[PDB]
Short mmCIF file of C-alpha atoms and ligand atoms in Angstrom, two decimals:
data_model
loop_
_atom_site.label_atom_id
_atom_site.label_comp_id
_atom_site.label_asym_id
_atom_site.label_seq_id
_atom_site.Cartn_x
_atom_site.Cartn_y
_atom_site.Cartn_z
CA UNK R 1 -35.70 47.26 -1.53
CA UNK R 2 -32.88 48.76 0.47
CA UNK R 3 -30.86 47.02 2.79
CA UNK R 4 -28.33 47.88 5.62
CA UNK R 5 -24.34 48.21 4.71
CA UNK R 6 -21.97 46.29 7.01
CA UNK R 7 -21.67 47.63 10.40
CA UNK R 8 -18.42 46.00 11.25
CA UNK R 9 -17.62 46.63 14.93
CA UNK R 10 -14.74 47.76 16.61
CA UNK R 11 -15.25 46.59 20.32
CA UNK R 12 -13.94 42.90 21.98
CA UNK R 13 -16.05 40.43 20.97
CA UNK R 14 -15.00 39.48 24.23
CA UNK R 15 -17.31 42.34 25.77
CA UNK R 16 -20.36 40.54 23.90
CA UNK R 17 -19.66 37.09 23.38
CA UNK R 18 -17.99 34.59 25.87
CA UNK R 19 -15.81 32.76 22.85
CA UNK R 20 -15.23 28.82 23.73
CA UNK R 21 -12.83 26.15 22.49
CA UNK R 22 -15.25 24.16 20.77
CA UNK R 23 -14.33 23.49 17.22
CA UNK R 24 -17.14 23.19 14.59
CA UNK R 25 -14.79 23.08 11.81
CA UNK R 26 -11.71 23.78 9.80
CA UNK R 27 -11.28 25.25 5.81
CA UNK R 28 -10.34 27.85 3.59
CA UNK R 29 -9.38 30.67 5.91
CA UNK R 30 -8.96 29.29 9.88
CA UNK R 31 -11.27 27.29 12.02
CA UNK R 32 -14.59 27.74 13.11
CA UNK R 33 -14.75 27.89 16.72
CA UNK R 34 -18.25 28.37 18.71
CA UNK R 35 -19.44 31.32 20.75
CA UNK R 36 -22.26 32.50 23.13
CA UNK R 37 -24.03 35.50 23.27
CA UNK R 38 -23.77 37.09 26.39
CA UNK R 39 -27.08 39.09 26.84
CA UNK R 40 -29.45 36.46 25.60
CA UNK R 41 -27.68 32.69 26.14
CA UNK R 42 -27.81 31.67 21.89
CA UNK R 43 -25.24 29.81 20.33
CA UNK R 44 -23.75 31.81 16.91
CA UNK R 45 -20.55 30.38 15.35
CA UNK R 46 -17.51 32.08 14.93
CA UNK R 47 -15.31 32.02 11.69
CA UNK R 48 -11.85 34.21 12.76
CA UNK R 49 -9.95 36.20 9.86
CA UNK R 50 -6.56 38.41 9.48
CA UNK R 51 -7.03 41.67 8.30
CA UNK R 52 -5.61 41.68 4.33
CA UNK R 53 -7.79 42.48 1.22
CA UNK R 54 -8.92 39.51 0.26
CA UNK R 55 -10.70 38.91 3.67
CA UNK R 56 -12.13 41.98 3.68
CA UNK R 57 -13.54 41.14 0.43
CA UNK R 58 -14.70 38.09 1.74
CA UNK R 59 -16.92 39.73 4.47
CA UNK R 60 -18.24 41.87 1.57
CA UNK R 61 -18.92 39.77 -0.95
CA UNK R 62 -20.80 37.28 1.85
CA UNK R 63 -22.64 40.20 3.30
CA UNK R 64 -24.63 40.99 0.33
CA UNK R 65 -25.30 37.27 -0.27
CA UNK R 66 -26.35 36.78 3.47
CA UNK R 67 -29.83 38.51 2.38
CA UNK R 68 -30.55 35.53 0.70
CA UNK R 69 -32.18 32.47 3.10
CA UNK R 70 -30.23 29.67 1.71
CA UNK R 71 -27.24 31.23 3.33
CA UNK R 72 -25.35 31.49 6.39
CA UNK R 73 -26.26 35.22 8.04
CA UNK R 74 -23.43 37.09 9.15
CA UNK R 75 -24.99 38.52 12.64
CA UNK R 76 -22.17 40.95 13.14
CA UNK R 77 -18.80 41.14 12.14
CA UNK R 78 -15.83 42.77 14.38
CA UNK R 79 -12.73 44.58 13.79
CA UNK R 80 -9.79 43.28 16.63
CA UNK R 81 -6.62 42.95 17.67
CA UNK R 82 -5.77 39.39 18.50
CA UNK R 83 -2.50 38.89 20.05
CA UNK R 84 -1.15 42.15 17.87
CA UNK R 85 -2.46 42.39 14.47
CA UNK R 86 -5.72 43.50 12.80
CA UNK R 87 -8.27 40.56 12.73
CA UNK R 88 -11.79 40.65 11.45
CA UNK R 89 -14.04 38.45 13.54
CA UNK R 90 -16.88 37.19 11.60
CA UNK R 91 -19.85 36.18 14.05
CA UNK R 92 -22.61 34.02 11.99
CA UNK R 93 -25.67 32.20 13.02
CA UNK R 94 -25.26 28.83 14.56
CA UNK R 95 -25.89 25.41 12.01
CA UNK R 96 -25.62 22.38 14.16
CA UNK R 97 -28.06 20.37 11.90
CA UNK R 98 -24.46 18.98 10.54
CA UNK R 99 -23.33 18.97 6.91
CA UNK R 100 -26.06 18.03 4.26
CA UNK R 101 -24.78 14.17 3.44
CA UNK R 102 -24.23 13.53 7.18
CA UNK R 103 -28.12 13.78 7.62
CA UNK R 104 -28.72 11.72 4.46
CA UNK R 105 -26.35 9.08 6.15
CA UNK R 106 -28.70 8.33 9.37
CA UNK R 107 -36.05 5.84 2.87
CA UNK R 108 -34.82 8.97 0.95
CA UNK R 109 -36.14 9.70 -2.02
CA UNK R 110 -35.77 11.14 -5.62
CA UNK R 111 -38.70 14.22 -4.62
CA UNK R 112 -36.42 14.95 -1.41
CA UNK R 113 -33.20 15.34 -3.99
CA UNK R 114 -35.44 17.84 -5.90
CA UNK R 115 -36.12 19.49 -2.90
CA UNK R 116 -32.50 19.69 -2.18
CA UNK R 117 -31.44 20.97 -5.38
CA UNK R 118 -33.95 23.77 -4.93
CA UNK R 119 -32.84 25.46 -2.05
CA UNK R 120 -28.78 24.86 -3.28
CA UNK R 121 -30.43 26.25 -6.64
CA UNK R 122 -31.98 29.73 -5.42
CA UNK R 123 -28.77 30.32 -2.71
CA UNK R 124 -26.67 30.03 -6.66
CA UNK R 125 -29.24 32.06 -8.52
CA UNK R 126 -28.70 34.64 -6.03
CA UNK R 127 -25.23 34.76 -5.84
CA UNK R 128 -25.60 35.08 -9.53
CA UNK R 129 -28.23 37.62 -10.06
CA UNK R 130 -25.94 40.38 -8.12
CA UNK R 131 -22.79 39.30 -10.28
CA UNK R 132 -21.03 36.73 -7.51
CA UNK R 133 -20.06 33.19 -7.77
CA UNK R 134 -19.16 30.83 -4.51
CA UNK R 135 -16.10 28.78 -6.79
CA UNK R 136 -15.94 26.56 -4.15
CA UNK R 137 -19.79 24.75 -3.35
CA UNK R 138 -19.03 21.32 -2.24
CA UNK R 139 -21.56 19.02 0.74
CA UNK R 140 -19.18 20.38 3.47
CA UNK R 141 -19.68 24.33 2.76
CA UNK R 142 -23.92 22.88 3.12
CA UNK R 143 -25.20 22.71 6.71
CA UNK R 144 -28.36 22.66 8.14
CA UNK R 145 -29.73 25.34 10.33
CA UNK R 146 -31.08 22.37 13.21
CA UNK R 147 -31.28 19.20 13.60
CA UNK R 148 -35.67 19.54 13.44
CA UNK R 149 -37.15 17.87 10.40
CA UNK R 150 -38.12 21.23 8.35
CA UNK R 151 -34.49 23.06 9.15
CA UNK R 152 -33.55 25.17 6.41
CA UNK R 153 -30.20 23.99 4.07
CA UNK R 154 -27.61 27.52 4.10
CA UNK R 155 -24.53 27.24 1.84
CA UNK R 156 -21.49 28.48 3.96
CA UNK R 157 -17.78 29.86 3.50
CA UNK R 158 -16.91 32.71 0.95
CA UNK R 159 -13.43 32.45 1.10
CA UNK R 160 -13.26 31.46 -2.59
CA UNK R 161 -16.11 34.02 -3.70
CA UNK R 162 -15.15 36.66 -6.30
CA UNK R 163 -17.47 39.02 -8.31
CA UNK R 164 -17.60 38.42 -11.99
CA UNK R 165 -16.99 41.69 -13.28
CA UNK R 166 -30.01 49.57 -24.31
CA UNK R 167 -32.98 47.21 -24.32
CA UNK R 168 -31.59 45.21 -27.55
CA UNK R 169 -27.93 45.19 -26.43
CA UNK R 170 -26.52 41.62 -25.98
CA UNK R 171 -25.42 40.38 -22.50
CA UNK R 172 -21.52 40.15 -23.40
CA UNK R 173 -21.75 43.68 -24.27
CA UNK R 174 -22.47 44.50 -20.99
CA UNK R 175 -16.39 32.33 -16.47
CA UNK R 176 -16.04 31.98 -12.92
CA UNK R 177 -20.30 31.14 -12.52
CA UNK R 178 -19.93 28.68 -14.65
CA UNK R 179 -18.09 26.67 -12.42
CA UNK R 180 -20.83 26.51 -9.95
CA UNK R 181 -23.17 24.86 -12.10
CA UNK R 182 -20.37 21.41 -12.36
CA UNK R 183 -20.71 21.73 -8.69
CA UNK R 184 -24.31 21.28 -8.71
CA UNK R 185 -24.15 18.82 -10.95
CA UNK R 186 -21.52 17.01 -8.51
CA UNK R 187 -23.92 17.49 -5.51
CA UNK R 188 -27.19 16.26 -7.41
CA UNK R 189 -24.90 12.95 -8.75
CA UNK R 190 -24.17 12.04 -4.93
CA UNK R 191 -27.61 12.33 -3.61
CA UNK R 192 -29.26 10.29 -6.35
CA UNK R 193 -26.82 7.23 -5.79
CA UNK R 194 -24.61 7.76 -2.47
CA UNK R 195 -21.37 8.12 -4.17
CA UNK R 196 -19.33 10.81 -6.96
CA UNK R 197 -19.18 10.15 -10.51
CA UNK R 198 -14.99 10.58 -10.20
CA UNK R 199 -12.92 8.86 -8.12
CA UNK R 200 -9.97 6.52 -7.91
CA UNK R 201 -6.01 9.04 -12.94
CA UNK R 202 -9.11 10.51 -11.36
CA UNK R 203 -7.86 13.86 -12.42
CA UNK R 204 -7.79 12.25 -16.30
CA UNK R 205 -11.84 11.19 -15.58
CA UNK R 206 -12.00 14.40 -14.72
CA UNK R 207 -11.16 16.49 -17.83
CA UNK R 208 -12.30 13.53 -20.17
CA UNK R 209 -16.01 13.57 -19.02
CA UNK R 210 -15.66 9.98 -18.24
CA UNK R 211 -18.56 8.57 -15.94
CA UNK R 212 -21.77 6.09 -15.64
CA UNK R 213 -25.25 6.12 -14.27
CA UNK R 214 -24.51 2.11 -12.81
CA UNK R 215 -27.03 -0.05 -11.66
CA UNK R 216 -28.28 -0.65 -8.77
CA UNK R 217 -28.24 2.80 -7.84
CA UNK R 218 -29.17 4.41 -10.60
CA UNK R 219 -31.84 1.64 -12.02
CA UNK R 220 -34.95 3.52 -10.46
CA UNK R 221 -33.67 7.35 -11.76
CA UNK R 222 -35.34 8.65 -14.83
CA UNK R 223 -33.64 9.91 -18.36
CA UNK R 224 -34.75 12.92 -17.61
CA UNK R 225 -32.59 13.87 -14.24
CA UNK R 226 -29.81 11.61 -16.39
CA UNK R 227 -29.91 14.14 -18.84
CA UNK R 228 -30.43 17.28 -16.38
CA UNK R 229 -26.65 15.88 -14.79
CA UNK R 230 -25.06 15.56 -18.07
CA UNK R 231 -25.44 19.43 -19.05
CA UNK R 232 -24.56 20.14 -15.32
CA UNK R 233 -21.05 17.81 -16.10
CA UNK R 234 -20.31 18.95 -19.77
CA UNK R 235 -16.41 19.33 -19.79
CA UNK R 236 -16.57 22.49 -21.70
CA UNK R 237 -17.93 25.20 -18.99
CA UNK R 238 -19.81 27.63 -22.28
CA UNK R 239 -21.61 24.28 -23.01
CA UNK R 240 -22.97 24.24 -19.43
CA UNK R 241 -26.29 25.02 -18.21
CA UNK R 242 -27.08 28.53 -16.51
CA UNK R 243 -28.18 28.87 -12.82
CA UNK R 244 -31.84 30.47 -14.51
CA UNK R 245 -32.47 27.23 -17.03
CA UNK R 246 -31.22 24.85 -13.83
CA UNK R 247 -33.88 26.73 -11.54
CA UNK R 248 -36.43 26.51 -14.75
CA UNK R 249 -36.02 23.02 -15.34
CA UNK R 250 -39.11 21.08 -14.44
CA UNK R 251 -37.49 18.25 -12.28
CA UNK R 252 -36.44 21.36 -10.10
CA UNK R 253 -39.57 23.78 -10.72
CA UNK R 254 -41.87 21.23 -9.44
CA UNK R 255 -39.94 19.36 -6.87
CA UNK R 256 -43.90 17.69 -6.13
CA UNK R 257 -44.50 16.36 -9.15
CA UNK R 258 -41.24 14.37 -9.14
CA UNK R 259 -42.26 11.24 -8.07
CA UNK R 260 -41.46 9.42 -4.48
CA UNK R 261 -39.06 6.95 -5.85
CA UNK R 262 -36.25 5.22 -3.12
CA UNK R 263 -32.68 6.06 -3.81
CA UNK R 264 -30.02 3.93 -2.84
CA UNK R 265 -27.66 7.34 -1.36
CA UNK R 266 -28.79 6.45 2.42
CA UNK R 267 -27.59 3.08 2.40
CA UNK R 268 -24.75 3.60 -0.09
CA UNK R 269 -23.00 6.60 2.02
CA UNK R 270 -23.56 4.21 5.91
CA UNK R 271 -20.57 2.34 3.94
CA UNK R 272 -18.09 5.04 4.09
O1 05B J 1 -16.46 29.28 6.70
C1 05B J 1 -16.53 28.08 6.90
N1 05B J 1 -15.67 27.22 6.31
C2 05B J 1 -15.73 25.76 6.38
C3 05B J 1 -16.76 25.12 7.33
C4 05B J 1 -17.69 24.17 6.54
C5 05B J 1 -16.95 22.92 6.05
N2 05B J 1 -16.26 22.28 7.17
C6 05B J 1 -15.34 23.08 7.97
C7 05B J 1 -16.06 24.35 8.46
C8 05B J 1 -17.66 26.14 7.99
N3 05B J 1 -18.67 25.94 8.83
C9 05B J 1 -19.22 27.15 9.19
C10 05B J 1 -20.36 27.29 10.12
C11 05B J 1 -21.21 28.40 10.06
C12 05B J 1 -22.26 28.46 10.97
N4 05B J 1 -22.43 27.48 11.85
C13 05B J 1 -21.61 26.43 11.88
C14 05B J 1 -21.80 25.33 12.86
C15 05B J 1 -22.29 25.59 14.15
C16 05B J 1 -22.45 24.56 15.05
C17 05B J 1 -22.14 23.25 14.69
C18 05B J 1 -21.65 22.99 13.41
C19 05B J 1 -21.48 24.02 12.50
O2 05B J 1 -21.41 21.64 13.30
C20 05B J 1 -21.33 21.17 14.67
O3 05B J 1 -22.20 22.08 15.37
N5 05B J 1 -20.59 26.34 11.03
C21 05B J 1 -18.55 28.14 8.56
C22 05B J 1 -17.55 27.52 7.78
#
């Protein structure tokens, strides 16, 4: 009930880690480039930051999401000078289990896209709960811890991630989340059926609302997660749904009881 505050080192990474060349990804800050501890011989990944407010707020806002399980843990995170400037080196556990649709790609079914939703569910009620959203959940920021059947789904990068600020008192006496939950919706559209509901003009589809559950791929899927992706896509983000009604919706509740149905998304995404 009362967990650690950020360490942040000072040493050379160098002294602890021997830091490699090989590139696990790009995004919304610098690349990702792979380490190896040292002591033990583990692999960690690397994610390398300037020092300016605003990535310092991204190494706080992630470390008090990285409690959570359906997250990437920061394992340490150091303060350095490369080549001659303040850097912060954020060191995080390794995910080579590869991004969530590139697992999907190589029977699948409509109780394993429950399951899914779940675990991208409690990382966003989390976030949520202590006031943060992620703004920016799409498949590549969700990788798998290994490659083992079982490996645990961790939502990544927090360069986007801002905080969002009696007994009878009302809650807006007390919408950046909201945003999230289109995500969601976005995510749980693609692993039903193997592609998004917008593409291409797209940005008119977009703020219109304009989409379709088309057959073949959507033929098997009930009203009822239909329905569950239409209040995730409302165009108007006050007539979304909330993180706590998502995670208390039955099709997500009791990922079990959803039945074992085959989806099309496996065979739909091997096309490119
Ligand atoms: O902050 C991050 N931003 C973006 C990405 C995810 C979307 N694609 C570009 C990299 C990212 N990925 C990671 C990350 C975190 C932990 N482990 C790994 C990782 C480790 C080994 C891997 C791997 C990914 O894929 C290949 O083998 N990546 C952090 C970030």
């Amino acid at each position: 009930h009362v967990k650690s505050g950020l360490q942040i080192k000072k040493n050379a990474i160098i002294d602890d880690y021997k830091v490699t060349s090989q590139v696990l990804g790009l995004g919304i800050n610098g690349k990702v480039l792979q380490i190896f501890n040292k002591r033990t011989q583990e692999k960690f990944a690397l994610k390398m930051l300037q020092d300016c407010p605003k990535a310092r707020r991204e190494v706080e806002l992630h470390w008090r999401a990285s409690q959570c399980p359906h997250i990437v843990r920061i394992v340490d995170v150091y303060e350095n000078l490369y080549a001659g400037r303040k850097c912060l080196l954020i060191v995080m556990e390794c995910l080579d289990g590869g991004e969530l649709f590139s697992r999907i790609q190589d029977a699948f079914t409509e109780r394993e896209a429950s399951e899914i939703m779940k675990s991208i569910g409690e990382a966003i009620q989390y976030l949520h709960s202590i006031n943060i959203a992620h703004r920016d959940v799409k498949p590549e920021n969700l990788l798998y811890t290994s490659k083992r059947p079982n490996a645990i789904l961790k939502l990544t990068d927090f360069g986007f991630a801002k905080e969002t600020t009696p007994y009878y008192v009302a809650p807006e006496v007390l919408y950046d989340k909201s945003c999230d939950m289109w995500s969601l919706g976005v995510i749980m559209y693609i692993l039903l059926c193997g592609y998004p509901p917008f593409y291409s003009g797209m940005k008119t589809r977009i703020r219109m609302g304009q989409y379709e559950f088309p057959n073949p791929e959507w033929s098997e899927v009930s009203e009822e997660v239909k329905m569950l992706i239409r209040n995730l896509l409302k165009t108007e983000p006050t007539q979304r749904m909330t993180i706590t009604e998502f995670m208390n919706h039955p099709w997500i509740m009791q990922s079990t009881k959803v039945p074992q149905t085959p989806l099309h998304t496996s065979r739909v995404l091997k096309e490119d």
